[PDB]
Write a protein that holds these residues in place. Structure first.
Motif, PDB file in Angstrom:
ATOM      1  N   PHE A  41       7.005 -75.547 -21.528  1.00  0.00           N
ATOM      2  CA  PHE A  41       7.002 -74.433 -20.595  1.00  0.00           C
ATOM      3  C   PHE A  41       5.804 -74.446 -19.658  1.00  0.00           C
ATOM      4  CE2 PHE A  41       9.006 -73.368 -24.612  1.00  0.00           C
ATOM      5  CZ  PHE A  41      10.250 -72.927 -24.213  1.00  0.00           C
ATOM      6  N   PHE A  91      11.871 -67.409 -19.742  1.00  0.00           N
ATOM      7  CA  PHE A  91      12.527 -67.411 -21.046  1.00  0.00           C
ATOM      8  C   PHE A  91      14.044 -67.440 -20.911  1.00  0.00           C
ATOM      9  CE2 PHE A  91       8.479 -65.124 -22.283  1.00  0.00           C
ATOM     10  CZ  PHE A  91       7.950 -66.214 -22.941  1.00  0.00           C
ATOM     11  N   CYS A  94      15.540 -70.802 -20.247  1.00  0.00           N
ATOM     12  CA  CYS A  94      15.692 -71.609 -21.450  1.00  0.00           C
ATOM     13  C   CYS A  94      16.929 -71.189 -22.237  1.00  0.00           C
ATOM     14  CB  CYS A  94      14.432 -71.490 -22.305  1.00  0.00           C
ATOM     15  SG  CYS A  94      14.402 -72.598 -23.724  1.00  0.00           S
ATOM     16  N   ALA A 108      11.116 -71.023 -27.469  1.00  0.00           N
ATOM     17  CA  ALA A 108      11.093 -69.964 -26.470  1.00  0.00           C
ATOM     18  C   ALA A 108      11.043 -68.594 -27.129  1.00  0.00           C
ATOM     19  CB  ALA A 108      12.304 -70.080 -25.546  1.00  0.00           C
ATOM     20  N   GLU A 112       8.227 -65.766 -26.484  1.00  0.00           N
ATOM     21  CA  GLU A 112       8.598 -64.465 -25.938  1.00  0.00           C
ATOM     22  C   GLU A 112       8.166 -63.338 -26.869  1.00  0.00           C
ATOM     23  OE1 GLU A 112      12.843 -63.614 -25.819  1.00  0.00           O
ATOM     24  OE2 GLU A 112      12.557 -62.405 -24.010  1.00  0.00           O
TER      25      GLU A 112
END
Ligand SMILES: Cc1cc(C)cc(Oc2nccc(-c3c(-c4ccc(I)cc4)ncn3[C@H]3CCN(CCN)C3)n2)c1
Length: 124
Positions: A41, A91, A94, A108, A112
């Protein structure tokens, strides 16, 4: 055939520093960046190197933490809500490209979860 990264600097936009924007860079971005799951990321998805030729057919609003870092550093955001939206777009990108149960989705989801934990400490 990667697209250009999202815009990160615009000298014509107005610029301000706020406690929330500083918190989003010094605390939220920093903590997420150093997380053990952060590496996929930290930059735009390189669909060419990863042999994902459908990524940018599926994902038409790309986002990543390297872009968010640059936007915060360049005072690209006026409101903290713009930065929070970029994290959420990141997010969901993904989750959209992948499926429930994929290992990448677990990464992810952990990030998050940490992101929301840091947003709850956002200063007034
Ligand atoms: C082979 C591999 C595995 C893993 C766990 C990571 C990896 O590194 C990497 N780097 C960058 C992006 C991706 C990625 C993403 C993605 C999408 C949007 C965002 I914002 C961030 C990441 N979605 C899937 N993938 C990989 C993972 C396996 N998948 C192939 C089979 N489904 C492709 N993965 C490489």
């Amino acid at each position: 055939m990667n697209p250009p990264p999202p815009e990160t600097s615009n000298p014509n936009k107005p610029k301000r520093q706020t406690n929330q924007l500083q918190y989003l860079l010094r605390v939220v971005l920093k903590t997420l960046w150093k997380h053990q799951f952060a590496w996929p990321f930290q930059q735009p998805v390189d669909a060419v190197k990863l042999n994902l030729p459908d990524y940018y057919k599926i994902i038409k609003t790309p986002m990543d933490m390297g872009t968010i870092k640059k936007r915060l550093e360049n005072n690209y955001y006026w409101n903290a809500q713009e930065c929070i939206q970029d994290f959420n777009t990141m997010f969901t990108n993904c989750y959209i490209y992948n499926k429930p149960g994929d290992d990448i989705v677990l990464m992810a989801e952990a990030l998050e979860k940490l992101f929301l934990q840091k947003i709850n400490e956002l200063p007034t």
